Amino acid sequence: GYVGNAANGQLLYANATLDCTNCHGAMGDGLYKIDPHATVFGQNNKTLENIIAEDMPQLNPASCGAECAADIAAYIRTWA
Amino acid sequence: YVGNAANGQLLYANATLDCTNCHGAMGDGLYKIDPHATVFGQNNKTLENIIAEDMPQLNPASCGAECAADIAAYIRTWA
Amino acid sequence: YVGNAANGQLLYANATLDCTNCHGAMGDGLYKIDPHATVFGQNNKTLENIIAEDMPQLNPASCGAECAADIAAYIRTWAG
Numbered sequence: 001g002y003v004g005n006a007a008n009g010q011l012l013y014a015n016a017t018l019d020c021t022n023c024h025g026a027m028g029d030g031l032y033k034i035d036p037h038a039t040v041f042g043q044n045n046k047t048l049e050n051i052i053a054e055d056m057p058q059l060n061p062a063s064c065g066a067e068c069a070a071d072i073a074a075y076i077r078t079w080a
Numbered sequence: 081y082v083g084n085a086a087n088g089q090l091l092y093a094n095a096t097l098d099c100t101n102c103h104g105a106m107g108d109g110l111y112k113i114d115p116h117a118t119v120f121g122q123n124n125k126t127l128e129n130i131i132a133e134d135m136p137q138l139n140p141a142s143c144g145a146e147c148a149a150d151i152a153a154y155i156r157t158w159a
Numbered sequence: 160y161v162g163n164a165a166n167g168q169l170l171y172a173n174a175t176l177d178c179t180n181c182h183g184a185m186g187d188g189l190y191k192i193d194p195h196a197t198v199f200g201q202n203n204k205t206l207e208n209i210i211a212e213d214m215p216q217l218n219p220a221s222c223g224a225e226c227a228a229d230i231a232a233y234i235r236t237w238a239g
C-alpha cells in the first residue's frame with residue numbers, strides 16, 4: 001500500500017493550483033469545515049483519502065488522485 | 081556558503097519577502113518555479129543567483145547571497 | 160517544565176492559534192518578534208509569560224504555560 005507522507009501533504013494542501021485553503025482555510029476552519037478526527041466522510045462514509053481522491057478539489061477532482069490524497073490526509077491528521 | 085534548508089523553509093515563507101504570494105507554497109502559483117531546473121532566465125543563472133539578484137521583485141536586496149542559498153536549498157526539496 | 164521546540168513549531172503553525180497571521184513564519188510579519196530579546200512589553204515579561212498571558216489575542220487562554228514554553232523554545236531558533 002501507499003502510505004501518505006505528511007510533509008508532502010503540507011505543501012500539497014497549500015498548493016496554489018489545488019487551492020484547498022481558499023475553501024477550507026489553513027486547517028479546515030474556513031468557509032467549508034473539515035473535521036480532522038473523523039474516520040468517515042460524506043453520505044457514502046468514505047475515508048479521508050477517498051473523499052479527497054474522488055471529490056476534491058471540486059474544480060477538477062482528478063487533479064489530486066490517490067497519492068496526493070494520501071499525503072494530504074496524513075497532513076490533515078496533524079491539525080488536531 | 082552552503083544552503084541550510086531549514087532556514088530556507090522559514091525565509092521562503094517570510095511575510096516580508098512574500099515569495100509565496102507570487103510563487104505559491106510549492107512553486108505552482110501565479111509564477112512557476114521549476115525545482116528541477118539548474119539554469120534560470122535569459123542569462124542562465126543558478127537558482128541561488130536568480131534569487132539573490134532578482135527576488136523578491138519589491139526589493140531584490142532584501143534576500144542576498146546567503147538567504148538565496150538557504151531558500152534554494154529548500155526549493156530543491158519540492159522535487 | 161522545559162519547552163519542546165519540536166512541539167513549539169507545530170503549535171506556532173497551528174491555525175487555531177494563528178500566530179503566523181499576525182507575526183509571520185519567522186516573526187517578520189505585521190507585528191515583529193525579536194528572538195534574541197529576554198524582556199517583552201511594558202511589564203518586561205519573559206517570552207513564555209507574554210505568550211501565556213497575552214497570546215493569541217483572540218483567546219489568550221488557548222495557549223497556556225506549557226504551550227508558551229514550547230513555542231518560546233521554537234522562537235529562539237529563529238535567531239539562527
Ligand code: HEC
Nearest residue numbers: 013018019020023032033034035041042052056057058072
Ligand atoms: C471551491 C470549493 C472547494 C475546493 C477548492 C476544495 N474543497 Fe473540499 N469541500 C468543499 C465543499 C463544499 C465540501 C462539502 C462541505 C464540507 O463538508 O466541508 C468539501 C468537503 C471536503 C472534505 C470532507 C469534509 C468533512 O469533514 O466532511 C474534505 C476532507 C475536503 N473537502 C478536502 C479538500 C482538499 C484536500 C482540497 C484541495 C486539495 C479541497 N477539499 C478543495 C469545497 C472545496
Ligand code: HEC
Nearest residue numbers: 092097098099102111112113114120121131135136137151
Ligand atoms: C510579486 C512578484 C514576485 C515576488 C514577491 C517574488 N517573485 Fe520570484 N519571480 C517573479 C516573476 C514575475 C518571475 C519570472 C517569471 C517566472 O519565472 O515565473 C520570477 C522568477 C523567480 C525564479 C525563476 C523561476 C524561473 O523558472 O525562471 C525564482 C527561483 C524565483 N522567482 C524565486 C523567488 C523567491 C525565492 C522569492 C522571495 C523570497 C521571490 N521569487 C519573490 C515574481 C515574484
Ligand code: HEC
Nearest residue numbers: 171176177178181190191192193199209210214215216230
Ligand atoms: C491577531 C493578532 C495576533 C495573534 C493572532 C497573535 N499575536 Fe502576538 N502580538 C500581537 C500584537 C498586536 C502584539 C503587540 C504589538 C507589537 O509587538 O508590536 C503582539 C505581541 C507578541 C509578542 C511580544 C513581541 C514584542 O516584542 O513586542 C510575542 C512574543 C507574541 N506576540 C507571540 C505570539 C504567539 C506565540 C502567538 C500565537 C500562538 C501570537 N503572538 C498570536 C498580535 C497577535
Ligand SMILES: [Cl-]
Nearest residue numbers: 016104106108
Ligand atoms: Cl503552489
Ligand SMILES: [Cl-]
Nearest residue numbers: 095183185187
Ligand atoms: Cl515572517
Ligand code: NA
Nearest residue numbers: 052053061064
Ligand atoms: Na481528487
Ligand code: NA
Nearest residue numbers: 131132140143
Ligand atoms: Na535577492
Ligand code: NA
Nearest residue numbers: 210211214219
Ligand atoms: Na496565552
